Design a protein around this ligand. Structure first.
Ligand SMILES: CCOP(=O)(OCC)C(=Cc1cc(C(C)(C)C)c(O)c(C(C)(C)C)c1)P(=O)(OCC)OCC
Ligand SMILES: CCOP(=O)(OCC)C(=Cc1cc(C(C)(C)C)c(O)c(C(C)(C)C)c1)P(=O)(OCC)OCC
Lengths: 293, 238, 293, 239
């Protein structure tokens, strides 16, 4: 494990690292004032689907006070509707905090703010959820199945192996890889600068950027950490960047289904998922992407 | 040495013929193609099974392991194969039925965005980097050997086989293309691009299957229905 | 059975007043606050800590859907935390007392008794009654007060063996729930306690005296009759032991409350009235209001 | 038969003498520091209480530290009831076992007025009105003594048993000796929480005067107001 890449490959890694640290609070300290849960048929097959999405997707919420208190929340099992949208207005507030932490992560990326405004928007829309999951995997724990997010601590609920859910299977598989923080931020650059996303005008620019980040990542693993049992790791990471788009796809259809029935999405969230120029249409994103205060 | 990069090429060559001379000479520089695309898909599914059987060690896997892999992978394995054929033509995509589809017959059939996506993301990149066939058979052998597929009797055998492909393609891509140092990576970089397109394709297959006004043949229908699979399960033991 | 008509018609008047003012489900308990998201002044806090220490409970709160909230209190340290479970307790009091000042107020004997002595009588039995009622919802096996949606579970020092018995307040409930009493027996202890002649301030002492006597023989003979003979022979003795121990538990509580209020003013004006915190109908302005309309 | 109600009476008569003739003939109807005096009678009667306990059957065959626990827990109310039962002989105040007679002026000006008046209206004035017999007194006390809800007992399931035998014996006696008074046995037990509530308000005074320090407190009384080391009590019980 000795190190050594091109100077360009070195500056671009630390460009991400000091963009990650600059915009990602691993303690979620600045995340408060958020919402919390409370203290006509045959189309309903649509409803049956929504409940199916969530019934593998159960979590024990938990708030720690600065004292020693644990305000723990456990989820209601399902026998009906409206009980299921419990954490939904809370999660909607979490993402609004994560996503502007995503928008800012890209906002400070030099390559990113060099792309035109109507291209930054497009890159963020298709990478928002992708970026969220990779950030959440850093704070994910295997032998408890919880996302220790500072004061918040979203746990897991055994039922029978909900690895039958790929979403969960992702976080588990991505975690057994034991990635260095330098690799996480490269997967983010790779995910953020994907040229296939709907709206990417400057295709060649973004395409080149991705490849750069990709080889940088492989070379990182190749000449840093290369305990020769660490081959195939670029493969495993590649397999995860690939799975991250099944997960992205399937959870976008998920979100759509839910909002279809129960509208809860924040004016941000709607812009990030589509719920005429873009800047007129993504005015809150437009403002967040010109913002210097 | 245990997954010879030449045996992979043998498979690709045995199931894919040379570029047609009309295409090589003249190409490069209706009223629902969707039925034809589906027709091509069902045709290629029989080809796909014969392809995978030639790929080393795939036939010694448990019988229902081969099914799971082919089933999880068929959609992107066909997209890889038709995106590679289509670098021969100047525009559009070329199906294995010979039919040449355009982005007018694709835009007026609803499959506009996805088709253009395959163009600018798969065709336009396999062309510009001059993707050779041995690299295709290897990338496809990778997509095929996906151990993150549910039900696998021994996911660490499929793990091992993807590694041997990864290793062999690594050795080859160095040997054949030294001046291109990060070629092996940009090959793998196409994988998430292939998935995101592949899932948009099933998102179309399932949409046209739902309408019912899109004739779908036995094997393609056996791939779009939940596990079951008798054709697939039969072909593998032959 | 095996009673006098006047005796059985006095149990009936209590069991009436009970269910008419004791909602076992606490359904109308609402808007209650919750623990949110010198050398002498040190000796005070030192003792106040030892009060609340043996009295640590989790606040398992259930919602209509099946969502269970849960509040695990902090661990012992300095500063203001156990004070947090205290505004919740303060509000639980105002609901318990209100249902006590209505249990008495709808009792005929208590109606006839003049206001000033009704005031006096409640003040001496107020806390003593709450515990008698809370024991009806106590579970010795699990160590929680199943107050409907809300539960108050007993924390574990070394869960192997509790010895929370070292706290008299708890041991009372374990001692009492051990006897396995009927609703009639429970409501009879409440009247013996409510109609205690030795409460400070009682003017018409003789009436209340003879009354407590009446409730006593009634309870003495309920056990002689209804319960099997060489089996529940030494009951009433056991019940009398509890009514005696109640005077201690009331004693403990009051000095306890006085000290906590001194270092942390948290008393409902109702609490103040019932526990005398800074003519008798004029001094108790709000307890006056609750009786006679 | 195992807790003879007569054995209880023998104990009461052995440790308490007759009502004095001056009291009988003059006290009734038809400044030296009250508190010090009260604490002096308390210490005096604490030795008496140990002698009384040893005469109450089966008490002395208990584990030694059980006897300590029982006595330490109940000494307070065993002495309050005993002095309350003497005071029914006099008209107005309390008669300590030192012979001293205290008033509601010597108590009011001493700050112990409320407890004083309470003991008058609740213990004395009720022991008198129901004419509390000494055998009943000696049984109520045996009951207060045998408290199995006291911490540390080697076997509460004997203190429970022995309390039950007093309960049965007192019940039989109270039936026998007073048939015309049917609810009498339960009016006696009704005095127990009245005794406790008064018994604790006295320690609430004993501690307040122990803290001021300007109230002389003798050895045995000091040992009782002190958390357990106990030399006196533990010694006496073996003699
Ligand atoms: C704390 C970490 O979990 P997590 O970030 O990533 C998934 C493991 C997570 C968050 C999350 C957030 C959103 C919003 C914010 C866009 C609304 C979703 O729409 C979804 C689903 C999956 C329902 C589509 C999930 P979790 O609550 O997802 C719901 C199942 O995860 C809990 C298992
Ligand atoms: C002693 C602790 O036990 P508990 O939890 O349980 C006993 C039943 C409790 C008793 C209690 C009540 C009060 C009120 C009523 C005056 C507020 C107190 O001030 C205190 C302390 C000890 C803080 C002085 C205790 P609960 O009665 O609170 C009710 C308001 O408990 C029920 C939740």
């Amino acid at each position: 494990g000795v190190q050594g890449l091109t100077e360009e490959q070195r500056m671009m890694i630390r460009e991400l690292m000091d963009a990650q640290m600059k915009t990602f609070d691993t303690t979620f300290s600045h995340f408060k004032n958020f919402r919390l849960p409370g203290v006509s048929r045959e189309e309903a097959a649509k409803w049956s689907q929504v409940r199916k999405d969530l019934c593998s997707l159960k979590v024990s919420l938990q708030l720690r006070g600065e004292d020693g208190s644990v305000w723990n929340y456990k989820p209601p099992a399902d026998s009906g509707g409206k009980e299921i949208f419990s954490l939904l207005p809370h999660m909607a507030d979490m993402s609004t905090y994560m996503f502007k932490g995503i928008i800012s992560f890209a906002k400070v990326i030099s390559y990113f703010r060099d792309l035109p405004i109507e291209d930054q928007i497009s890159l963020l829309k298709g990478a928002a959820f992708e970026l969220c999951q990779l950030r959440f995997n850093t704070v994910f724990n295997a032998e408890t199945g919880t996302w220790e997010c500072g004061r918040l601590s979203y746990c897991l609920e055994d039922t029978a192996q909900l690895l039958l859910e790929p979403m969960l299977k992702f976080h588990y598989m991505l975690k057994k890889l034991q990635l260095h923080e330098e690799e996480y931020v490269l997967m983010q650059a790779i995910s953020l600068f994907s040229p296939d996303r709907p709206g990417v005008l400057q295709h060649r620019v973004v395409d080149q950027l991705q490849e750069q980040f990709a080889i940088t990542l492989k070379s990182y693993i190749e000449c840093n950490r290369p305990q020769p049992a660490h081959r195939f790791l670029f493969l495993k990471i590649m397999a995860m960047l690939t799975e991250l788009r099944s997960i992205n796809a399937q959870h976008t259809q998920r979100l759509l289904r839910i909002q279809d029935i129960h509208p809860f999405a924040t004016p941000l969230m709607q812009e990030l998922f589509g719920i005429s120029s873009l800047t007129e249409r993504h005015k809150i994103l437009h403002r967040l992407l010109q913002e210097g205060s | 040495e245990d997954m010879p990069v030449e045996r992979i090429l043998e498979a690709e060559l045995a199931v894919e013929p040379k570029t047609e001379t009309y295409v090589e000479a003249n190409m490069g520089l209706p009223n629902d193609p969707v039925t034809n695309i589906c027709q091509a898909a069902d045709k290629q599914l029989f080809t796909l099974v014969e392809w995978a059987k030639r790929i080393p060690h795939f036939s010694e896997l448990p019988l229902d392991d081969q099914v799971i892999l082919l089933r999880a992978g068929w959609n992107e394995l066909l997209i890889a194969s038709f995106s590679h054929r289509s670098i021969a033509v100047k525009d559009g995509i070329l199906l294995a039925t010979g039919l040449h589809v355009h982005r007018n017959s694709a835009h007026s059939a609803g499959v506009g965005a996805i088709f253009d996506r395959v163009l600018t993301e798969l065709v336009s990149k396999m062309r510009d980097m001059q993707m050779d066939k041995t690299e295709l058979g290897c990338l496809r052998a990778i997509v095929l050997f996906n151990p993150d597929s549910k039900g696998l009797s021994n996911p660490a055998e499929v793990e091992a086989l993807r590694e041997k492909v990864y290793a062999s393609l690594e050795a080859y891509c160095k040997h054949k293309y030294p001046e291109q140092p990060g070629r092996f990576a940009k090959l793998l970089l196409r994988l998430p691009a292939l998935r995101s397109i592949g899932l948009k394709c099933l998102e179309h297959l399932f949409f046209f299957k739902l309408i019912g006004d899109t004739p779908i043949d036995t094997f393609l229908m056996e791939m779009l229905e939940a596990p079951r699979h008798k054709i697939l399960h039969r072909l593998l033991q032959e």
